[PDB]
Amino acid sequence: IPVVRLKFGEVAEATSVVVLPVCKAEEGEKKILEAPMEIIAGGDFKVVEAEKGWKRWVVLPSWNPVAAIGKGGVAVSFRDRKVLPWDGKEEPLLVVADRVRNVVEADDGYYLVVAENGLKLEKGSDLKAREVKESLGMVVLVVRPPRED
Amino acid sequence: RIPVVRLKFGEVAEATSVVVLPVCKAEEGEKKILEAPMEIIAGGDFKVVEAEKGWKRWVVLPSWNPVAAIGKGGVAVSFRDDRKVLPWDGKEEPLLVVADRVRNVVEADDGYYLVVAENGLKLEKGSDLKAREVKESLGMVVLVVRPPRED
Lengths: 149, 151
What we know:
2 copies of one chain form a homodimer.
Chain A: E1 3-5, E2 17-24, H1 29-34, E3 39-42, E4 47-50, E5 56-61, H2 64-69, E6 73-78, E7 93-98, E8 110-115, E9 118-123, H3 124-129, E10 137-144
PDB class: chaperone
Keywords: assembly chaperone, chaperone
Assembly: dimeric
């Protein structure tokens, strides 16, 4: 379950890049259910065509787990909420999920579900004990902000 | 003056910086171009595009100088392949024209601009548009993208 840093052009096995619709985690499950499901690149310039309009979009490198999704991919934004105001703030995060694989099946796996306010990730095994069989989608990759020195 | 670039196969996957633009098919006329989102500047740590109205058709280009410079108002307009008179010479290439909708007011004499055509849309020269007293256009042409060929 890869936690990678945003850098472009260094997945030297990739011919393309990947375009995803984005949701705010704070905005809840409706938006995630509504984001376009099919994003189809075609033509000489790989013009991408969703089947439905959407306002938020993101480009990511064709990382192995990102490119495997195809149908149902979405990117979800998480922001931070520290007790001590002088503590180093935890980086914002971009969680890539697979809505087609919404079915809880891997005990190791991690799934996106509704939180008291917003969304949260939860381990497969924890969801089974909680009697949940349907999540909003399998977490396939996490993106941390670009970094250097 | 106007940069005309050929995209190489694999060039956007090899780029270290990238821009997303909303696409309009030229044949679909000006209603579509006016509808395209304007606020397409990529923000946050992840360069998430957060537009003002939803849009289904997008394209990723390497962040070339003139494309990055546009900011708000950028759009890429597809022109499909026209049939040549002699069919065995193949189709004439598809084309992406990248326009600056913020700079629609006709100002450059050697600049080029997107105006309404009978068949869809045309590029017209700034000097020419000034002579006909056309003050506004659909957008200043900033860049032309030729598709990747074999040879």
